[PDB]
């Protein structure tokens, strides 16, 4: 579970034996052609994978480039949180588990999560910071029909740590009955190989579609980072190809104003939520709030394999601003009719940051925007435009 | 030629019959135009996500013992297949040199995916809808807004589907030079109706590919929601006098005794509406009426040409379910299936229930999905009590 110095399983002592319960059963799973069989039918015929490599003409033509989005944003639930939500949920299950707990942030996860947990008749309870119940309402209100428990955290900065602290609390509380889902590539292993194990068929679907637009490996893949899974899934099977892997953080108000999410850029070596990791952290130690106008974002720490990558020089790491994303929302919604999710919207921003004339640019669109219509319609900056 | 036996034709002002005349020749030109098709049906794949899936619902198998599979056009890009439709004509509008596009909607499905296709194409973009559905659909709205369109309530007669559509042909009419008119349903003079049914038939022609790859063998029933017919007509079409036994459903409202639905097929009288002669929601002096239906997608009160013809020949069988039967329904696939429908499409979920199909296979087409409806779903008073 170690990625160079980072990762590892930093927890309370009593949650040593479902870890490893959880790695026994992973393993078992990994050989199991009844496990993939079913796994891989859902992602096909229930999630609609493989999802579409699109070029975008007049994105391609405002920046001289050959823009191609990824389109995970046209998997059921309108993310690429449903990869891991399927997978994990139907491991919960066939390891004789009844009940389904998590967090989420932008709601994605949440309702990838009950999803699955309707599909297979489970129990689920999601934690999500009240902040975020309210500006991601939609995927409240999907998750109250599809069966969910949706508790608001209430606590501290009220938004996805908070929700993960709560989750976590849950699980330690129920371990008979319940079986944690992250979100994210952030955890005690085996989570964050498990999370980027079932995320890579983004990657492995782009390596095999890009040869038949380009005929060679793209020169650029850029996706957004917060914990990472995303990301992951779409730069893992691209490692050492030379591709330029470039990983964009939340810069929230400023890299310099202390309003952010950019762990990678920004934070200190720390522990959080079972892995060792950037962590924003101040110098006594203590974590920190993050910020971010995209709840899906907003998180102060990375996972322990993007920690790794940039350590290593494997994947490149930069951040946007608020303001530079909800532009790119506003640009993808109008120049090609399609709305992304605000997080996927700081890889889009980040095309004014690359010198792309002439160059083949795979931007990883992780999920669609319509939870975050009322937010960004009515935001100060959207306001004064 | 325009007529589906008798049903049809081309009913409207005499100023709109050389803007027809233009449209039905440069229709017919790219019939043939491999230029056209490639660059359609790419976007197709890329930009809509066409083939969709046909998904084994295993859970709605169990609970009616039957083999009962959705066709997943709810998973298209803007969630319902009415993109279909809205790519291929926002592109001839394009090819035809127009620079504007108009529509009505009252899911704001329609609405939503003109205002994607025109962006696409860099077309100004104006969709009138009824001034009720602009509230009990407002996800569409806000959708519209950051697509570039302008969307127009339109507060007249009863401020949903019928009224959104009577303002669009007005704005069509005086801006004929610059504006293509973009139905969202097969409802409309000849050429529309074969030109919607034309992009929609993909539906049924990946379903007939699909299904023996599930089952060795065509399905017992295919079943979809019926209000202008255009998702019935598309996975319809490639089924007609296949032996299939194909079941358009039709909003009842509140029941078909109630005065208060939009059942076009069963309860209107022959007439002309938006083009078509047709069946239509009428009083006996000729008035048409105002339909209803807790699904504003169905809320209109004309029916495609093509059924009319379908009913008549017996090609297509014709039934309804109630609002709270289509609110059941939703409920039941999101808690079962983890998938949340659309409120027109559950009128067809609904449907399961009213015939033996213990033992038979089933296709339903789950033509979108129903996040647009959340909120009205939540608040409804059937709902609530319960
Ligand atoms: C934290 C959440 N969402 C994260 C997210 C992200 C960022 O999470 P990763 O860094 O794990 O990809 C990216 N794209 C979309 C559409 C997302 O919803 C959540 O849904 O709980
Ligand atoms: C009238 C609209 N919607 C109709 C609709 C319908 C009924 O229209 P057709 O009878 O033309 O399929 C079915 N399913 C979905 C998801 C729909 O949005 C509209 O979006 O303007
Ligand atoms: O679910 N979950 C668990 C732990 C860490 C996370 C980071 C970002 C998003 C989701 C997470
Ligand atoms: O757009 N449009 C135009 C004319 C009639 C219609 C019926 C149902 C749905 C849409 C329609
Ligand atoms: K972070
Ligand atoms: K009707």
């Given at each position: 579970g170690n990625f160079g110095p980072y990762g590892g399983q930093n927890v309370p002592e009593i949650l040593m034996g479902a870890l490893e319960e959880l790695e026994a059963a992973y393993e078992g799973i990994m050989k199991d052609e009844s496990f993939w069989k079913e796994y891989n039918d859902l992602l096909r015929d229930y999630a609609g994978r493989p999802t579409p490599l699109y070029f975008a003409r007049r994105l391609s033509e405002k920046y001289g480039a050959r823009v191609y989005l990824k389109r995970e944003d046209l998997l059921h639930t309108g993310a690429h949180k449903i990869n891991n939500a399927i997978g994990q949920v139907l491991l919960a299950?066939?390891?004789?588990?009844?009940?389904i707990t998590a967090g989420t942030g932008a709601g994605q996860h949440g309702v990838a999560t009950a999803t699955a947990a309707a599909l297979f008749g489970m129990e689920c309870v999601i934690y999500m910071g009240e902040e975020d119940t309210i500006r991601?309402?939609?995927?409240?209100?999907?998750?109250?029909?599809?069966?969910?428990?949706?508790?608001?955290?209430?606590?501290?900065?009220?938004?996805?740590?908070?929700?993960?602290?709560?989750?976590?609390?849950?699980?330690?509380?129920?371990?008979?009955t319940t079986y944690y889902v992250p979100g994210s590539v952030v955890g005690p292993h085996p989570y964050p190989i498990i999370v980027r194990n079932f995320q890579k068929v983004i990657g492995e679907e782009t390596k095999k579609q890009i040869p038949e637009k380009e005929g060679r490996l793209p020169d650029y893949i850029v996706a957004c980072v917060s914990g990472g899974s995303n990301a992951a899934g779409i730069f893992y099977p691209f490692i050492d190809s030379g591709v330029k892997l470039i990983g964009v953080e939340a810069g929230g108000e400023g890299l310099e104003t202390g309003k952010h999410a950019a762990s990678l850029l920004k934070g200190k070596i720390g522990?959080?939520?079972?892995?060792?990791?950037?962590?924003?952290?101040?110098?006594?130690?203590?974590v920190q709030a993050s910020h971010s106008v995209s709840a899906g974002l907003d998180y102060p720490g990375v996972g322990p394999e993007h920690a790794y990558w940039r350590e290593t020089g494997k994947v490149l790491y930069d951040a946007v601003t608020d303001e530079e994303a909800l532009d790119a929302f506003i640009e993808l919604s109008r120049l090609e009719g399609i709305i992304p999710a605000l997080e996927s919207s700081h890889a889009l921003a980040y095309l004014k940051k690359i010198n792309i004339k002439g160059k083949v640019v795979v931007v990883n669109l992780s999920g669609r925007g319509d939870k975050d219509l009322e937010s960004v319609l009515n935001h100060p900056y959207v306001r004064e435009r």
């Open positions: 299950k066939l390891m004789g588990k009844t009940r991601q309402k939609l995927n409240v209100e999907r998750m109250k029909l599809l069966g969910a428990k949706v508790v608001p955290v209430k606590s501290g900065s009220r938004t996805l740590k908070d929700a993960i602290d709560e989750a976590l609390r849950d699980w330690i509380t129920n371990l008979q522990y959080l939520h079972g892995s060792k990791t950037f962590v924003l952290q101040d110098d006594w130690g203590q």
